[PDB]
Design a protein around this ligand. Structure first.
Ligand SMILES: [C][C][C][C][C][C][C][C][C][C][C][C][C][C][C]C(=O)O[C][C]([O])[C]OP([O])(=O)O[C][C]N([C])([C])[C]
Ligand SMILES: CC(C)CCC[C@@H](C)[C@H]1CC[C@H]2[C@@H]3CC=C4C[C@@H](O)CC[C@]4(C)[C@H]3CC[C@]12C
Lengths: 286, 207, 339, 56
C-alpha cells in the first residue's frame, strides 16, 4: 500500500496518495527486474560458477531473488484485497507469507554478510560445501518459519494479528507481533552495516612492504563499484526503517524508504548482476 | 561386492588427500643463475620443490629454471599458484637484461594473467658498494635518477613495475634482502594472504 | 667454405627428395574418395563420467583388455578405473606431483608415468605383498618426459624434452637404444600394431619414423608449420595422423612418404592435444583446445561429429583395443566414456 | 662443432634418399581396402544394439 507500514505504526494520510503510485510503479519494476534476473540465472545456471565461492554466492543471490519475488507478489495480493471481504480468508495467509518471506530474505542477506565476514577475517579455512549449504538453508528458512508460527500462534487468539483496515502486523497499544519484524530485520541490517565497513577496512589496507605507489587515487572507482554492488544485496536501504520508528510523522523518511526499497530488485539487477563483467562479456554478444 | 568397498575406500583416501592439499599455497619461484634465489629458498635434474611451514601454513616453492627446455610447452601446468616469487640480482648489471626479459615474458603469458608477483631485489647490500665503485649513469644509457642509493632502487622498482601490462589484474609487490629469515617469511605470508583475500573478493564479485 | 659444401649437398638432397615426392603425388586421397558414401552425422553419448580426480587430468591410456583404464593428473596421483562399473582399482601416490605422460602395459601388469621430474616411474599393479610399489625409476633424460609407451612387459619407449627418444630396458634400467636427430622438443609418439617401428612428433613440425630394432631415423615427414602434439598410427600400421597447434590433423603414409589430407576447418583456430583412430581407421578422433573434441571422416576430411560437454580443454582421448568406446579426459578433472 | 652435426644430417639425408616410394593411388587403394575390410567390425561407425553393448 504505502510500503511504509512494514516498519511504521502508521502512515500519514497527507503523503499516502502521493507515495502510493511511486510504491506501485517501484514494485512493478521490481517484479520485472526479478523476472529478468531469474531468466538470466536459469540461462547461466551451473556454467559461470566454478569454485565453491561462486557456487555459494550464486545460491545466496538466487535464494534472495526468489524470496523477493514471492514476497513482493504476496504483498501485492494482500494490498489489493479488502480488509472486510476476507478478514481471515485471504489477507491472513497473505500477511503470514509476506512477513515470513521478508524475514527469510533478511536472514539470507545475513547469510551473505556473515559469509563475506567469515571468508575475509579467516583467510585460510576450508569448510564442507554441502554442510555449509545445509546450515544456511536450515537457519535461513527454519528460523523464519519458527518465528512466523510462534507469532501466528501467540497473537491469533486475541485477534490482534491485524488492526482495523490494515491487515499487516499491528502496533500502537495492542499486542506485540510487529516486534518480530522491527527488532530482527533492523538488527540484521545493522550486522550488514558493520560487515560492509569491515570490507572497507580490507579495501584500504596499507601496501605490504615498501613497494612504491601504484595508482594515483585510481582505486576510488573500484571502491565505489564494490560499495554500489554490495549495498542492495545486503539490504542496507532497510535501515531507514528505524527512522519510521523514531518519528513516524515526517514524510521524507517514508518517501526515501519506499523509493529505495521499491526499486531494490532493480538495484540488485543493475549492480549485483549487470555490473559483473563476467556476465557483461557473455551478455553483450547474446 | 568388494569392488564397491574398494572404490569407496579409494574415494575416501582421495578426499582426505584433497582436504590436506587444500591448505597448501603452492608458490612458484623464478629468477636467473646466481641471482640470489638460493638465499630466498634456503632460509627454512628438472624442477625442485621445497616445502616450508610458516604460521601453520605450508608452502611449496618450485625452482623453475633448471628444465632448460621450451617454457611454453609445460608452463600451462603451473596454474593455481597463489603468486610468482621472483628474485633479481641488483649487483650484477649483466644479469639485469635477461632478468627483465624473463620477467616480461612470464608476466605476459596468457596463463599468468591473474597471478600476482612477489618479486624480490636481492644483493641489495652489495649494490650500494657497486654504485659507489661504478656510477649507475655509466651502466645504463637511460636516466639513473638521483645519486643516492634510495632513488636508484626506486628507479629500478619503477622500470620493473611498468613492464607488467596487466596492471589492474595483477598486484605485484617489491621487497629487498633481509638478514633475518623471519622477515622474508613474514613478508611472503603477508603477500600470500593478501593475494588470497583479493582472489576471494574478486570471486565474490565485489571487484 | 667446407660447411658451405655440406649445406649445398643437403639442399640438393632435399630438393631431390621433394621432387621425388611431387612425382609420386599423382592424385590426392580426397579426389579418389569422391565415390565413397559419407558416414553422416554420428550420435555420441557419455555412457560413464569417471569422477574423483582433484586436478587437471593431463594424460591417460586404455587397458589391453578394453576394460581397465588409467589416468594421471597434476594432483600427484595415478588412478586406475574400471570403465564398465566406474569403480576405482588402484590409486598410486606418485612421488612427483607433476606427471605429463602415462602408459598401460599390453598385459595389464606394469604402469608407466612421467613428467617434469625427467624420470620414468614404472609401477607393478600385481605385487605379492599387495600394496603398489615403484618397480623401477628410469633416469637419464635431461628434459621433461613428454610421452612413454610399452612395447612389452620388459621394454619401454620414452620421449624426452631434450629432442631425444629412448628405448629403455625395464630390468636393466639403462638406455638400450637412443634415437636423436630432432631439432625440436619431441612431444608425443605412437607404436605400430606390430611394435617393430614407431613414429614420434617433435616441436619442429617434423614427424620422424624410427625403427626400434635398428635405432635409426627410417623416415622424416615435414608437412606442418607449428608444434606437433598428437601422434597415432592407423590400425593397418601403414598410415598415421599428426595433430598440430593449427587445428590441422595431417594424415601421412609410411609407404607413400606423402601427406594424404589435412583435416581442418575455418571455425577451429586452436590446436590439437591428442588424436586417435577407430578400430577400422575410418572414423578419426581429435581433441582441441576449444573445450570440445571433434570426430572426422579419415577418408573424406569432413567433420562427422562434435563431442562437446567438457568444461575445460580436453587433454587426452583414446579408443579401446576392440573399439567399443572412446575415453576422453579433460582439464576439468573429468573422464567421459563416449560411445 | 656444427660441422659434425651437418655431416651427420647430410649422411642421414643420403640414407633416406634411396628409399622406394609407391604411388599415392596405391596407398589410397590399400587404405580403402582396409577400411571396407573391417567396416562391419567398427562399433563406433555402426551403432551396436544395447543387448551386447557393455556401456549401454
Ligand atoms: C547458501 C547456504 C549458506 C549461506 C551463506 C553461507 C554462510 C553460512 C555460515 C558461515 C559459517 C558459519 C559457521 C560458524 C563459523 C565457523 O564455523 O567457525 C567459527 C570460528 O570460531 C570463527 O570465529 P569468529 O571470531 O567468530 O569469526 C567470525 C565468523 N563469523 C561467522 C561470526 C563471521
Ligand atoms: C551505510 C549508509 C550508506 C546508509 C545507512 C542507512 C541507515 C542505516 C541510517 C541512515 C540514517 C540513519 C539514522 C539517522 C539518525 C538517527 C537518529 C538517532 O536516533 C540515531 C540513529 C538514527 C535513527 C540513524 C539510524 C541509522 C540510519 C537509519
Amino acid at each position: 500500500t504505502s510500503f511504509s507500514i512494514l516498519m511504521s505504526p502508521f502512515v500519514p494520510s497527507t503523503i499516502f496518495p502521493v507515495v502510493k503510485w511511486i510504491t506501485y510503479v517501484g514494485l512493478g519494476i521490481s517484479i520485472g527486474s526479478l523476472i529478468l534476473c531469474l531468466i538470466i540465472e536459469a540461462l547461466f545456471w551451473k556454467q559461470i560458477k566454478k569454485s565453491q565461492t561462486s557456487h555459494t554466492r550464486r545460491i545466496c543471490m538466487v535464494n534472495i531473488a526468489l524470496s523477493l519475488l514471492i514476497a513482493d507478489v504476496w504483498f501485492i495480493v494482500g494490498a489489493t484485497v479488502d480488509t472486510t471481504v476476507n478478514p481471515s480468508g485471504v489477507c491472513t495467509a497473505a500477511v503470514f507469507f509476506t512477513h515470513f518471506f521478508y524475514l527469510s530474505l533478511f536472514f539470507w542477506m545475513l547469510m551473505l554478510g556473515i559469509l563475506l565476514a567469515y571468508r575475509i577475517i579467516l583467510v585460510f579455512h576450508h569448510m564442507a560445501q554441502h554442510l555449509m549449504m545445509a546450515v544456511g538453508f536450515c537457519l535461513g528458512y527454519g528460523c523464519p518459519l519458527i518465528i512466523s508460527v510462534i507469532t501466528i500462534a501467540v497473537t491469533q487468539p486475541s485477534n490482534t494479528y491485524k488492526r482495523k483496515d490494515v491487515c499487516w502486523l499491528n502496533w500502537s497499544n495492542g499486542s506485540k507481533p510487529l516486534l518480530a519484524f522491527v527488532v530482527p530485520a533492523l538488527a540484521i541490517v545493522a550486522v550488514n552495516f558493520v560487515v560492509v565497513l569491515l570490507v572497507l577496512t580490507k579495501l584500504w589496507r596499507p601496501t605490504v612492504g615498501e613497494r612504491l605507489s601504484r595508482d594515483d587515487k585510481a582505486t576510488i572507482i573500484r571502491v565505489g563499484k564494490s560499495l554500489l554492488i554490495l549495498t542492495p544485496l545486503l539490504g542496507l536501504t532497510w535501515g531507514f526503517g528505524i527512522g519510521t520508528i523514531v518519528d513516524s510523522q515526517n514524510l521524507a523518511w517514508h518517501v526515501i524508504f519506499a523509493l529505495l526499497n521499491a526499486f531494490q530488485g532493480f538495484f540488485i539487477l543493475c549492480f549485483g548482476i549487470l555490473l559483473d563483467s563476467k556476465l557483461r562479456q557473455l551478455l553483450f554478444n547474446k | 561386492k568388494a569392488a564397491v568397498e574398494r572404490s569407496k575406500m579409494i574415494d575416501r583416501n582421495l578426499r582426505e588427500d584433497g582436504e590436506k592439499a587444500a591448505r597448501e599455497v603452492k608458490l612458484l619461484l623464478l629468477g636467473a643463475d646466481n641471482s640470489g634465489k638460493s638465499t630466498i629458498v634456503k632460509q627454512m635434474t628438472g624442477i625442485v620443490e621445497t616445502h616450508f611451514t610458516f604460521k601453520d601454513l605450508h608452502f611449496k616453492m618450485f625452482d623453475v629454471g633448471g628444465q632448460r627446455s621450451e617454457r611454453k610447452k609445460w608452463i600451462h601446468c603451473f596454474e593455481d599458484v597463489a603468486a610468482i616469487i621472483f628474485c633479481v640480482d641488483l649487483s650484477d648489471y649483466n644479469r639485469m637484461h635477461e632478468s627483465m626479459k624473463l620477467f616480461d615474458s612470464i608476466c605476459n603469458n596468457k596463463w599468468f594473467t591473474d597471478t600476482s608477483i612477489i618479486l624480490f631485489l636481492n644483493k641489495k647490500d652489495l649494490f650500494e658498494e657497486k654504485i659507489k665503485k661504478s656510477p649507475l649513469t655509466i651502466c645504463y644509457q637511460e636516466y639513473a635518477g638521483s645519486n643516492t642509493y634510495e632513488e636508484a632502487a626506486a628507479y629500478i622498482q619503477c622500470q620493473f613495475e611498468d613492464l607488467n601490462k596487466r596492471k589492474d589484474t595483477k598486484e605485484i609487490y617489491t621487497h629487498f634482502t633481509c638478514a633475518t629469515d623471519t622477515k622474508n617469511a613474514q613478508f611472503i605470508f603477508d603477500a600470500v594472504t593478501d593475494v588470497i583475500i583479493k582472489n576471494n573478493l574478486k570471486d565474490c564479485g565485489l571487484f | 667454405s667446407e660447411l658451405d659444401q655440406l649445406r649445398q649437398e643437403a639442399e640438393q638432397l632435399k630438393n631431390q627428395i621433394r621432387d621425388a615426392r611431387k612425382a609420386c603425388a599423382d592424385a590426392t586421397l580426397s579426389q579418389i574418395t569422391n565415390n565413397i558414401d559419407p558416414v553422416g552425422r554420428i550420435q555420441m553419448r557419455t555412457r560413464r563420467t569417471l569422477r574423483g580426480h582433484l586436478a587437471k587430468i593431463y594424460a591417460m591410456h586404455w587397458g589391453t583388455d578394453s576394460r581397465l583404464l588409467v589416468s594421471a593428473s597434476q594432483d600427484g596421483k595415478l588412478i586406475i578405473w574400471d570403465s564398465y562399473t566406474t569403480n576405482k582399482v588402484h590409486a598410486i601416490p606418485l612421488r612427483s606431483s607433476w606427471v605429463m605422460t602415462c602408459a598401460y602395459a599390453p598385459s595389464g601388469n606394469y604402469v608407466a608415468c612421467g613428467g617434469l621430474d625427467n624420470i620414468c616411474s614404472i609401477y607393478n599393479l600385481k605385487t605379492r605383498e599387495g600394496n603398489v610399489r615403484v618397480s623401477r625409476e628410469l633416469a637419464g633424460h635431461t628434459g621433461y618426459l613428454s610421452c612413454c609407451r610399452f612395447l612389452d612387459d620388459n621394454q619401454i619407449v620414452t620421449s624426452s624434452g631434450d629432442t631425444t627418444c629412448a628405448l629403455w630396458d625395464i630390468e636393466t634400467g639403462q638406455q638400450t637404444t637412443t634415437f636423436t636427430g630432432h631439432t625440436g622438443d619431441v612431444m608425443s609418439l605412437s607404436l605400430a600394431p606390430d611394435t617393430r617401428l614407431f613414429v614420434s612428433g617433435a616441436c619442429d613440425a617434423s614427424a620422424k619414423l624410427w625403427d626400434v630394432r635398428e635405432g635409426m631415423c627410417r623416415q622424416t615427414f615435414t608437412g606442418h608449420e607449428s608444434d606437433i602434439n598428437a601422434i597415432c598410427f592407423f590400425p593397418n600400421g601403414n598410415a598415421f595422423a599428426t595433430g598440430s597447434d593449427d587445428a590441422t590433423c595431417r594424415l601421412f603414409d609410411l609407404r607413400a612418404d606423402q601427406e594424404l589430407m589435412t583435416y581442418s576447418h575455418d571455425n577451429i583456430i586452436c590446436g590439437i592435444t591428442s588424436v586417435s583412430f577407430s578400430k577400422s581407421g575410418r572414423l578419426l578422433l581429435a581433441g582441441y583446445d576449444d573445450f570440445n573434441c571433434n570426430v572426422w571422416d579419415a577418408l573424406k576430411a569432413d567433420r562427422a561429429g562434435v563431442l562437446a560437454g567438457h568444461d575445460n580443454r580436453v587433454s587426452c582421448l583414446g579408443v579401446t583395443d576392440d573399439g567399443m568406446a572412446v575415453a576422453t579426459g579433460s582439464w576439468d578433472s573429468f573422464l567421459k566414456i563416449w560411445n | 662443432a656444427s660441422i659434425a652435426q651437418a655431416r651427420k644430417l647430410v649422411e642421414q639425408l643420403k640414407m633416406e634418399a634411396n628409399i622406394d616410394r609407391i604411388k599415392v593411388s596405391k596407398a589410397a587403394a590399400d587404405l580403402m581396402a582396409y577400411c571396407e575390410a573391417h567396416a562391419k567390425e567398427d562399433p563406433l561407425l555402426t551403432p551396436v544394439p544395447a543387448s551386447e553393448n557393455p556401456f549401454r
